């Protein structure tokens, strides 16, 4: 099944699709095509959980139901700095204003 993802690092968000049956390593190949950093220089996360290269996205819990085109799932991304990886740091999106009174019950 197709899964729809937001791959998020700092203030960067990639919108991409893959398959339940694609591996973490294949998602890293998609990031490399876009951000020009190879898989061995990337760590992908579901929340705080570091993802192994061999697992399928589906095995990591990215499914047709949790990763939808209209509601994509977040994958966290950290690059190697020097001899070590930077900490996972995702800047939140801005927040909406207060709901106007005429839009409440």
């Amino acid at each position: 099944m197709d899964v729809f993802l937001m791959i998020r690092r700092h203030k960067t968000t990639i919108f991409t699709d893959a398959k339940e049956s694609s591996t973490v390593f294949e998602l890293k190949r998609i990031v490399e095509g876009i951000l020009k950093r190879p898989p061995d220089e990337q760590r992908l996360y579901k929340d705080d959980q570091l993802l192994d290269d061999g697992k399928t996205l589906g095995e990591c819990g990215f499914t047709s139901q949790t990763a939808r085109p209209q509601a994509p799932a977040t994958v966290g991304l950290a690059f190697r700095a020097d001899d070590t990886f930077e900490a996972l740091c995702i800047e939140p999106f801005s927040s909406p204003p207060e709901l106007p009174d005429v839009m409440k019950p």
Partner: protein, 155 residues
């Protein structure tokens, strides 16, 4: 003239399954022989229903509550044809992909009473867009124009 969007009086029976593959309560609408829309009983989300129609009858489908447009087999109009091998005709009713703007107008309409549109902090052009509710007559006008245009293409 005569209305272009009307059912033909064929009296050739056709068995149809109206499949509501939408999350909306669906109003089936039959265009009679004078091209006037007639409402039929509503279809709850996820429900199919065997119904009796005729070859060359025109149907369209709407949200029962809001009158938003729905597709039937990926198009606006459904015309029952000859049953073959005794196989009933499927009418797969779905949401269209609404423009983001139209989907936004549906949501603000469902949250705000019309008398309160003018309390919203948006430009006047969008007050007018909120007030321009979907309705079958407007869509029949539009569909008639698109058919008249289509029949005139080529020389």
């Amino acid at each position: 003239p005569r209305p272009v969007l009307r059912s033909v009086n064929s009296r050739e029976p056709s068995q149809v399954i109206f499949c509501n593959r939408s999350p909306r309560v669906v109003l089936p609408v039959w265009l009679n022989f004078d091209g006037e829309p007639q409402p039929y009983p509503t279809l709850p989300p996820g429900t199919g229903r065997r119904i009796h129609s005729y070859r060359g009858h025109l149907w369209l489908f709407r949200d029962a509550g809001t009158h938003d447009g729905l597709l039937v087999n990926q198009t606006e109009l459904f015309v029952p044809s000859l049953n073959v091998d005794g196989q009933p005709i499927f009418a797969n009713i779905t949401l269209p992909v609404y423009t983001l703007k139209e989907r936004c107008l549906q949501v603000v309409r469902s949250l705000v009473k019309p008398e309160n549109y003018r309390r919203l902090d948006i430009v006047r052009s969008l007050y007018e867009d909120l007030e321009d509710h979907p309705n079958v007559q407007k869509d029949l006008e539009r569909l008639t124009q698109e058919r008249i245009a289509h029949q005139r293409m080529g020389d």
